[PDB]
Design a binder for this molecule. Structure first.
Ligand SMILES: *C/C=C(C)/C=C/C=C(C)/C=C/C1=C(C)CCCC1(C)C
Length: 137
């Protein structure tokens, strides 16, 4: 399918819960929740290869990967991790991360194109699932 595009968030649920699992304290959790309101995702997909720029008001970060090939990124709370993205279906991919040092909750993320033109992105820590919905700008 075509993940490429310029996505703006319309909904973001359970983000505060996820940052709690990772040890973020209350006052900074509320600030990150407000930051997530302004999130944009830019995707260039050529075949199996994705270039993904995730950004808020004061921060931007680039995730370049190929389906099936290990790469390195960070978790939602900054720790470096090895990642591997695989398809689940035609329009959904899931990424499993493993920490490069130490220990912590089991983190992962998914991205899915819907039949209705939305990009749905979920990030998980152990049992807790944050769900984020975007539309093309
Ligand atoms: C495929 C999409 C991915 C891997 C997106 C990952 C997004 C994040 C790690 C986002 C982090 C943050 C914000 C969106 C704003 C609030 C604070 C952060 C740093 C947890």
């Amino acid at each position: 399918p075509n993940f490429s595009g310029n996505w703006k968030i319309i909904r973001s649920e359970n983000f505060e819960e996820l940052l709690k699992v990772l040890g973020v304290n209350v006052m900074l959790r509320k600030i990150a929740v407000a930051a997530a309101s302004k999130q944009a995702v830019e995707i260039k997909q050529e075949g199996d290869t994705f270039y993904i720029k995730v950004s808020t008001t004061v921060y931007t970060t680039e995730i370049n990967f190929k389906v099936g090939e290990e790469f390195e990124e960070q978790t939602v709370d900054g720790r470096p991790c090895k990642s591997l993205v695989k398809w689940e279906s035609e329009n959904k991919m899931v990424c499993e991360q493993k920490l490069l040092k130490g220990e912590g909750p089991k983190t992962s993320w998914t991205k899915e194109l819907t039949n209705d033109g939305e990009l749905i992105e979920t990030m998980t820590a152990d049992d807790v699932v944050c769900t984020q919905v975007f539309v093309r700008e």
